[PDB]
Amino acid sequence: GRTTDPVRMYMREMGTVELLTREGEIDIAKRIEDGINQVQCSVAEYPEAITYLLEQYDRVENSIDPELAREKFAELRAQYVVTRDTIKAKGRSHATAQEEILKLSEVFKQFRLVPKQFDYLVNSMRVMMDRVRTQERLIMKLCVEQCKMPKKNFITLFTGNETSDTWFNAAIAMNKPWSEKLHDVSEEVHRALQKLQQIEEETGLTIEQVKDINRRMSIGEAKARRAKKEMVEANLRLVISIAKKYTNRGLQFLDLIQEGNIGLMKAVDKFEYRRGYKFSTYATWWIRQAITRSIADQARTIRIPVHMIETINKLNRISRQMLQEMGREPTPEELAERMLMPEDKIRKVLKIAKEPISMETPIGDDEDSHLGDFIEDTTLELPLDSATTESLRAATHDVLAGLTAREAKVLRMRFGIDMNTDYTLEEVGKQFDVTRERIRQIEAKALRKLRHPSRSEVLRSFLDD
Amino acid sequence: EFDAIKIALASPDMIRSWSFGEVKKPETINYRTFKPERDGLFCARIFGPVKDYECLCGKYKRLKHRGVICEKCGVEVTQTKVRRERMGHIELASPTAHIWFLKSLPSRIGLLLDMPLRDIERVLYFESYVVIEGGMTNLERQQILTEEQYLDALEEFGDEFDAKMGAEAIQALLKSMDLEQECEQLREELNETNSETKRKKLTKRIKLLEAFVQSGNKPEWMILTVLPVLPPDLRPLVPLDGGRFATSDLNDLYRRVINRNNRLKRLLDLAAPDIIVRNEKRMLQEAVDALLDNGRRGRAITGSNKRPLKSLADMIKGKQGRFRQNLLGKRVDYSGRSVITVGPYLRLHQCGLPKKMALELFKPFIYGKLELRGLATTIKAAKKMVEREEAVVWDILDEVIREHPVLLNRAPTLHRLGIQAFEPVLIEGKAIQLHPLVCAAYNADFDGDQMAVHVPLTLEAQLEARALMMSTNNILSPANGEPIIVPSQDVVLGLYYMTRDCVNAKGEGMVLTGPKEAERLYRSGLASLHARVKVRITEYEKDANGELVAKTSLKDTTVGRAILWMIVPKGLPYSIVNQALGKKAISKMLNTCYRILGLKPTVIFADQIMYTGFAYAARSGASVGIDDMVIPEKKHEIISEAEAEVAEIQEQFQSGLVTAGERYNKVIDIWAAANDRVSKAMMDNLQTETVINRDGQEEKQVSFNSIYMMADSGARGSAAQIRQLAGMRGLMAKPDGSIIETPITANFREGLNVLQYFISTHGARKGLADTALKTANSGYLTRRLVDVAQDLVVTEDDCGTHEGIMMTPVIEGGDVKEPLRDRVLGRVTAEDVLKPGTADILVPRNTLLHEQWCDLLEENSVDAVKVRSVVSCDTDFGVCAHCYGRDLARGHIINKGEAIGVIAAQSIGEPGTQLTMSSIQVKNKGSIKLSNVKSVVNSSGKLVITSRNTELKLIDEFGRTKESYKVPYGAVLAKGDGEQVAGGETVANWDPHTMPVITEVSGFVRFTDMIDGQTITRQTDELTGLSSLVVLDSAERTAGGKDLRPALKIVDAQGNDVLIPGTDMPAQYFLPGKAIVQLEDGVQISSGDTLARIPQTGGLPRVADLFEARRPKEPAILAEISGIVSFGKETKGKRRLVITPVDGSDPYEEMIPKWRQLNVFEGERVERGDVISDGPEAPHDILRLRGVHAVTRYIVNEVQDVYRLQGVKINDKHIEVIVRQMLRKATIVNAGSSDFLEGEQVEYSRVKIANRELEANGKVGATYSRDLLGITKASLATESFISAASFQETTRVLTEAAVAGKRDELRGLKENVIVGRLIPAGTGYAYHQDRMRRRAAG
Amino acid sequence: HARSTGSYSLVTQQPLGGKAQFGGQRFGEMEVWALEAYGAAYTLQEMLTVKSDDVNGRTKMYKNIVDGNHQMEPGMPESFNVLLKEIRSLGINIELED
DNA sequence: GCCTTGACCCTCCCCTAAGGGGAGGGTTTAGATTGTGTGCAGTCTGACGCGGCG
DNA sequence: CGCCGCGTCAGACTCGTAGGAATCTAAACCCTCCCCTTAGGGGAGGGTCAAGGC
């Protein structure tokens, strides 16, 4: 396309959308709102396996009268306890049921945007619906291994009848030998189908009404999603016009844009058109919040917490005006007196605001000598020290041979020489069954002999450290 | 231990099995307590502990528990060194493309899928779709779409087809394809379309698919899903003094990847619109590309100081990468440097070393020696004794350095005599003292230079420093076999002043008993050094079987030569000292002393010469004054007599008699002549102008002027510089190259003007600027030569060939420039040559031609010998000792195990800084010989020949060719063959602006083959009235007329074409445009009459172009095969030409532009190789048409043409080594059951040792052709990827070696230098050999 | 200037350079050429491993020299291992085969 | 000499009553505002290989 | 097939010195965890000081 720049590639794919007018955003928000309540409608007459609000009003048990908070919850359930008495009559799809449960929907429409409370009721069937799905997958991974059979008669009448296994009698009807080529495995089909039939027991309702109105419940959750998408896609110029005042502060342009878009996606989710204000006035807050939060979390090699960021910024703002006013830079005393903090903290803050230098920094007249060439390894031992360590080990091994073997084993155990660990008196006397005190006696013996001048001046040579 | 190195692509499971855990966030370290944050880039749970045997919290310590893993902080208790070995990884949220396998041309993805790079770079930016599956539809695999066409296909076809976008699409394409089926269907469907343009790409794609199938790789691993992370200690974060930190750039580049991958993992959970997820995937791709190779696919990401960040690929490649900076040369311990100065009292094996330098460099030796004598109890007391500088320390130091050699080195090291081993002598002071005779191999002097000192530590290094590198084994040069220790500046002046003579010297006439009496008389004050006397002298010789026989005589000589004779050793003749000696005579002395006596007498004799030269130069008293520069008294008149001429040649321009150009070009030479007159007057007034009188009266002798004495002896100076001191300076050039008109008529003894000085500064700066900007070209050429030649080593003793090359002298360009003796000395004879009779055998036919054999060849006269060469050696992977010949620095047959490639490269490269960057007469009398000839008698009683390529040679008294020319075609030879003519006689006459082309036989000329309206005019010379039908230019062209190119032909009394004796030939030739023909119609001519006529950078660049095998921009055209020539189908893009064998097929005909004047007419019969035009020849054609020896001979002669023009001497096998290395590849023509392809390029040794085994058990082998590659294209085409990767272009080498799946066997010298092993050459050759034997054992 | 031992750099662990740093002398690329034109293989193997860059050998050599035993035991240099790591970090699988 | 008592002694860590002070982390904020911007860098010459268009 | 455009790769070695590293705005509210405060208590674990039994 004759270009490889991704900022132009973005600003080009972003310009194929039109800006909205004051009525466009209102009637987009209206359908965003009514799809999410069409869903809440569809959740209404699902069986008691849902987490329905019977005692959610009691689970929790603008400051509204307690008598108002206790009473208006009695309207809905006062009609609901008598309404779904008709769950039995004429199957599961009775028309009085649709009429009065969409009258419960007439009641339901009153409400508007809410936290994940509503979410946790539709999840009430998530954990239950896909379950059903996956179980009828199991039957299939138990049929295809043994026999091959055309799927569009079987699964079609599977969708249709759901009364009993009598639809398998529709498999032999065409009189081809693939009818009962299956042998000794159909009880596994009956296994999984029977377990989902006891799932049907706990639900009490057949699958082709639950999935039937889930087909229309999925219409609301998609029709809200699509309107949210085209409410987001029409406002990207706002993000791009805000995020151009945060440049040269540690992030690149497209990073700031992709941080602003995640805030716009929340301003779209929290909007309320009834309050009468435009969309820009509410969205700018979330856009700026996202960009500001990402500048303080990224964009430093060594990360500083947010409270220290605000302290640094405040001290910069004070020193600017004191420099404009005095004509000089103020000493930390003149900053402590006005910032009203203890001077040691003002001295502590002033060290934390420096970014590490690159190891490729050219140092000299040329550019073949770098800063990283003159950096020395500090954790190495000098060879004079290695030789000294080995010579001292040999000298000690020679002096430890003069005195008794049993009387040197105790020194080896007591100072840990040639062993994996140091030991204590009682655990050494464990193997000697000698008293707590005799060990100390023989140690004061050995250490008294070992400094007699017939022996000491070979080891004394080392202690000039 | 290990034996090889492999390279391949890395799967995701391989990258996950190198790692110790996943990096999840950009945290480096805590800002208050600088400890590594968990799961960040410096994490101590993944990468290891930051202190020895400590966890991070502090719970565990003290090396009791060594394998425990702390439960609080997860760090295991171990040593911190492991933070240099452990790696981590990053799991990417969407696959990305590796930039190397996409954008290093040719792209491997576009070559594997057969897609253009534009389509791939459009699918990778979410800018177009691509069809993966066709289903059952009109769309097919790899079809490209746009969004609208994708929507149309969706609403029209639905689910059946499959189209994707981004690197997931490309991974699906690479993953779905089948390689074996595809390559086999490229096999049988190439033979129809095996046209060349398709042939090249089809065979390239075939070998790529076959490489992927055999190597084991999978094509989809070129798309990344897991990323590795380098260990933390190789990209450190380090505190400086002051609390400031410093960091690497890979940290900056890893953080961007991590926190653009995390954001995509967030957006894929918020379920955002796709316009935003696409922007994230693009940003992630760009970030990974900048981490791998920064500036390759766009703009380079820069840091907060506006410099581009360095990447993982910039740390490997280039002049400052790992390879050239840390692996091929290092910094070392036990070494120092200092200023050098001269010590004149030293022996040749000795250097002076300061006491303090030696005390520092030798510290552990002194510690051990101190505590062995019991002088110190422990090493830490020895340290303080040494630090206090007690008196016994200086006595331990003197016996430590006793018999411990020391290596000295001065940069730049142009050849191997730049590092030499000496024995040290402790001195006071701080400068190093160097012997005055080794300053010529070093190129050193004492205007401020500095030298480096190195100490060998082990027993083997000491043995090698004594036996191989000591300065008393290095007296000969390894480029030519000449001595290198010749005396330079004051040895020469002192020896020259002591062996001169003078007239009427004090003490003239006496008769003395020997040299001792002459010395005793000179010291006493009774005689002079220059006095003519008679002395009795005893001298020795050896003709016995190793014994010396003496003889005495009385000789006439001077005192000084009798004094000098006490230095010369026993066995040399007196005639070497009886001259007045100079630099050349002294070099001759040293060389004959080396030839007769040997090495050790030579190294004693050189020292004695140095001492006595210094002593007598001191006693002479030579000085320089202002009166020693004598200006001739008749310069002032030569100057006026040139100025008068330039005035009277200006006034022939002011009156319109001469042009401006000729006026300038005449003033130039009338000033040059006066300059030459002044210079010769000056030099004759100075050279013998001494009138010293004798017993009765005056006479003349050579001068004792100081300047003349130091110029004539060869100590310092020349005539060209005394010319500027005492003559005039001359003519100056502009910076353009133009010469100014008025010259500089002054000299340095008299002083220049402001203007003469100003115009003299131009050339000074031009020279100073050329030097500095030429040194770089010379160094770069040396590096390429070393890289092509580095792995060639003498491997065997005798290969057993009978091939060779024919050595003759070079006699062109004038007199004999190179005798035959200088070109066979040291070589081995290829066949049993015989002195010019018959069966004069001198040979077991393997004969090292040492000096006695060359004398035997020169007492007879033989001028061609067949010798042995390396370009014809039959040994594979090396040369044999007999094809190489003599070791030019040792004087005997080469030893097996020698590194001849590095020596060849260094010898050719070292002198590169001195490179600049109408009728035949006969001199002496001898026979005249002709070759390549075909003759005819003339009408005027002379000889003519109808050969174009003949040769005319002059034969000496005995039959050795002394001069050789070639005559132009059509020329009339003044005299015939077999004549003994004297000098001063012309033998052939040709026109300076014309050459005629003659008839074949006496016949009757007809105007035919041309009409009016043709390329012919009727242009008759109106003043003289002579005109034939004249051939025209293309400006007077009539295109419809050139149907037949005009020529006037010869007929019989039959009216038809004449017989030619021997063959049924057409007697006449058709000539190209603009021919001058004025021969009458109806006026007939004889055989050989004038029918028609023919009207009409050196230095380092040329050497580099010869070794790089460039193609000239006007290459001559040669005959592909032998056959009768004719013009072809005449398709008029430009002219067509064909040749036709008398028996064979002739599909070969090709294009020639009409600007290219042809020299071969339609009746010619040509043989394979001869020219169809003129122009510089191309070496690939010389290798294709003629053999290997022809291109070898051409290259070595054209290279030596440049070196000899400057006075540089290089032997000729040093160029043959390079030519052998440029010929290592072969190309297959017909496989024939040989497991090779039909136009693949293979190594020549592989083909050779395959055919030697196929043909062994009765089978048909392969047929091939040889190739010629330049030095830098043959360095890169070798079969080890480590040498090639460390030479140049590391990216291409590594990507190709990676997808191919190569391995490396570590057989050269550089491979073993990289990994720190013993090289296979020299004292390491035996070791490797033994190892190779175990390769046969297992 | 002269140096027996001293300080080593951080990444590659070779001697530092300069007189102000008490540094070693560069044995450059064209001095290795001279040394392998002589055929001096042991001098070169000790210039590369135990004088410059081998970490265990350069401390074992010191304690052999103090004890009057002029012998070395060379290993593999450190910059080769650095090279292998930086090539593996590009996605390429390079290894030493035995 | 080769062991057993009964006294004494030391350092290190955790604890008391009623909060105080700070470090480091979470969340929202409703008049409207809708396409970058540096007062860029662009700056060498020669050889070679391949694609795109006549 | 041929010419031209355009993109990639290369350009000597060893030493010296030279301080510091360069713009750039959010504010009110909540929570949990960790150490601090007087003047000594309490225990755990590990050492030391005389005295005899044999």
Ligand code: 118
């Ligand atoms: C410079 C420019 C704007 C703000 Sb503000 C703000 C700050 C304090 C009190 C009220 C408003 C802001 C909002 C969210 C995140 C970061 C900063 C602000 C917001 C919308 C419109 C105008 C100003 C601050 C400094």
Ligand SMILES: [Mg+2]
């Ligand atoms: Mg000098």
Ligand SMILES: [Zn+2]
């Ligand atoms: Zn721990």
Ligand SMILES: [Zn+2]
């Ligand atoms: Zn041979």
